[PDB]
Design a protein around this ligand. Structure first.
Ligand SMILES: [Cl-]
Ligand SMILES: [Cl-]
Ligand SMILES: [Cl-]
Ligand SMILES: [Cl-]
Ligand SMILES: [Cl-]
Ligand SMILES: [Cl-]
Ligand SMILES: [Cl-]
Ligand SMILES: [Cu+2]
Length: 235
């Protein structure tokens, strides 16, 4: 159970974004139905009044929280991967539009899930803004909690993979457009009951064998990190 508070651009807090530049849902409950319209941008997908200005190459940091800013972030039981997708804003997230910029699942080198590192990072994970056409975009940050994912939600609706989905309105101003954004995948639709990484038993299947759901990270993507960029407590 987790939400996005706001974003940072090159280590500068853009301030509380909830219902302002984040298409915030009414609460921190997960989406679980893979065919739901709520898979696009959670249960209250609408245009909010602001879009955060960035340039290609900027570090864009998402900041998550549970109940209050810079708290426990997400329950430690909620082990799983983190992804970020981008789509042009005029799509409203509809159709074959979502391009993956970032994936982090289980790191073999340090024996930790992305969610575990997110908590240590005070809810902060980043992407480099890609060299796409200037204009208005949606950045779709997705946490999949796998602690009940040995069941399919379609077979037991009390259980299933839990999707914490947050869409931020981002405006890219300066960009050389050296990597035009291609078509991508649809949400809902990209994840199905048969997709690798959706049904996984963390209690009996080694995390070293986990494969996160496709699609693969776009060739145009410039990278990211799970790491604290800024101290929320210094405000
Ligand atoms: Cl940043
Ligand atoms: Cl704006
Ligand atoms: Cl906890
Ligand atoms: Cl936007
Ligand atoms: Cl550029
Ligand atoms: Cl294309
Ligand atoms: Cl990949
Ligand atoms: Cu939860």
């Amino acid at each position: 159970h987790t939400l996005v508070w706001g974003v940072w651009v090159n280590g500068v807090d853009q301030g509380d974004g909830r219902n302002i530049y984040i298409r915030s849902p009414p609460n921190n409950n997960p989406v679980k139905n893979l065919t739901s319209p709520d898979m696009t941008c959670n249960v209250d997908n609408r245009v909010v009044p602001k879009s955060v200005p960035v340039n290609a190459g900027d570090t864009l940091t998402f900041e998550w929280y549970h109940n209050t800013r810079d708290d426990d972030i997400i329950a430690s039981s909620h082990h799983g991967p983190i992804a970020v997708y981008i789509a042009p804003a005029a799509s409203n997230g509809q159709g074959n539009v979502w391009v993956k910029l970032f994936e982090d699942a289980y790191n073999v080198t340090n024996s930790t899930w992305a969610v575990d590192r997110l908590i240590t990072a005070h809810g902060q994970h980043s992407v480099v803004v890609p060299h796409v056409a200037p204009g208005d975009y949606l950045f779709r940050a997705e946490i999949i909690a796998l602690h009940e994912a040995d069941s399919l939600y379609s077979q037991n609706p009390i259980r299933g993979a839990q999707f914490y989905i947050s869409c931020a309105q981002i405006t890219i101003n300066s960009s050389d457009d050296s990597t035009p954004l291609p078509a991508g995948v649809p949400f809902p639709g990209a994840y199905t009951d048969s997709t690798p990484g959706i049904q996984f038993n963390i209690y009996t299947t080694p995390a070293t064998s986990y494969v996160a759901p496709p699609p693969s990270v776009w060739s145009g993507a410039l990278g990211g990190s799970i790491a604290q960029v800024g101290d929320a407590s210094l405000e």
